[model samples]
Target: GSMTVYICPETGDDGNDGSELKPLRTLYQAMIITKSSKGDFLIRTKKDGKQVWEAASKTALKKSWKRYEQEMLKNEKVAAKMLEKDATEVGVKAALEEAKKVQIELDTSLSYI
Candidate 1:
């Protein structure tokens, strides 16, 4: 299961330092505040920009996950092929380098790590 990132529009105080005295900037900020304790992450954003607990529906998240998985796998396959071509000097090293490059491209495309 993935960890949840919450965005609280109602939380932040402009001059506050993100404490009880000064709240967080947004629900996303608040969720991030607790990220250290959380495992895998998912960010929660509002439809209308309000401080709410509602995140993307389970179905939506699942679909998104599937799409991401598919794309990642596709990219991995491409990287694998490239690594195979460079197998002599590359071996695992080549594969790893290709994988890293692919991951960088994917992260750029997705805007998230």
Candidate 2:
């Protein structure tokens, strides 16, 4: 669950922090940061053919986690019946409704009219 560091000197810039920019300065910069990345290191560029500097525009959170995109898909696929992405947790809606519904129910009944 680490992060990836991609560089496209032709399309990217060296001045800004690569973050979502995906546009870094040098090989040394990416290599050093990549050591701590604990993930993949890709120097390829498949964007709109902009030498990375321009393609930085596509570097959203998706660009950040493409390494695990399919892995996540397969993960959810296996867990299809196991859980849902909507509420995320078992207690979020399912368990919470049980707790709050009883409170609301008792509100009127126990009001001591």
Candidate 3:
């Protein structure tokens, strides 16, 4: 594995080598570099003033999936509470049930992965 590829959409150029200080402009360019290499690569991006890490390997993918599952668990808890509160209203109840159902489906899908 090598150093992470950096992408700064606001202040980067495609000609750069995707370094921390001189990042590439787009995810497409970063993906191009990772696709050509055999080892795992981490792509870091900045968008809307937030940092994000993207993995281009099995291990990273698994780690990302685990993180996603954890987030969904918290979201599910919040949705469950919302459903409990909105259980009295017909329209809100239906929407909440749908949302809860979607969350269950997403959890099941992630488990299958």
Candidate 4:
């Protein structure tokens, strides 16, 4: 089985071994452990003041892409108009370009993840 690293910024300590009961305090520590581990590392973190979700697995990433696509499609016109507006906006261009890269990754198989 894969290792699960729990991080609770509000209640955790850095000295802990990233267990459910004694979670790690920061995402940096969790990332360091995850990168060194051979098997899959499931990271659970706080969201909206509680532990709400696990780290993204391949399947979870795909599901997220699907949801994003659905939302984009649902608001295609508004999104396109906003993007056009953003292109004219000075500070937004960089962010929009970065988002384009993310879209390219989503269109691909996302093997780099």
Each candidate: RMSD to true structure?
27.7, 16.9, 25.8, 26.8
- Give the worst 10-residue stretch by lDDT in candidate 4: 78-87
Clashes of 4: 0
- The local lDDT score (0 to 100) that residue 67 gets in candidate 4 is 52
Clashing pairs in 1: 3-40, 6-27, 7-27, 7-28, 8-26, 8-27, 12-24
Sorted on TM-score, highest at the top, how do the candidates line up?
4, 3, 2, 1
* CA lDDT, every model vs. true structure: 0.39, 0.44, 0.53, 0.52
Cα lDDT, model 1, residue 109: 58
Best by TM-score: 4
Q: After superposition, how far is residue 41 of candidate 2 from its true place, in Å?
A: 1.4
**Once model 4 is optimally superposed onto the true structure by TM-score, how far is the C-alpha of residue 106 displaced, in angstroms?**
92
lDDT of 4 by residue, 1-113 (tens): 45666766668765667677877765445434443233333456556876664664656434434654565547555332111123353453444333333333356667798
In model 3, state the lDDT of residue 101.
38
Candidate 4, pairs of clashing residues:
none
Task: Compute each candidate's TM-score over C-alphas.
Answer: 0.27, 0.31, 0.33, 0.35
Best by lDDT: 3
Cα lDDT tens digits, model 3, 1-113, are 45466766667775666777877765445544553333344466554877765555665445544644575546554321111124454553434333333433344456555
Q: For residues 1-113, what per-residue lDDT tens digits would candidate 2 score against the true structure?
A: 44455666666554434445655544334434443333454554646754332222335334444634454445654321112137454544444334343433344555666
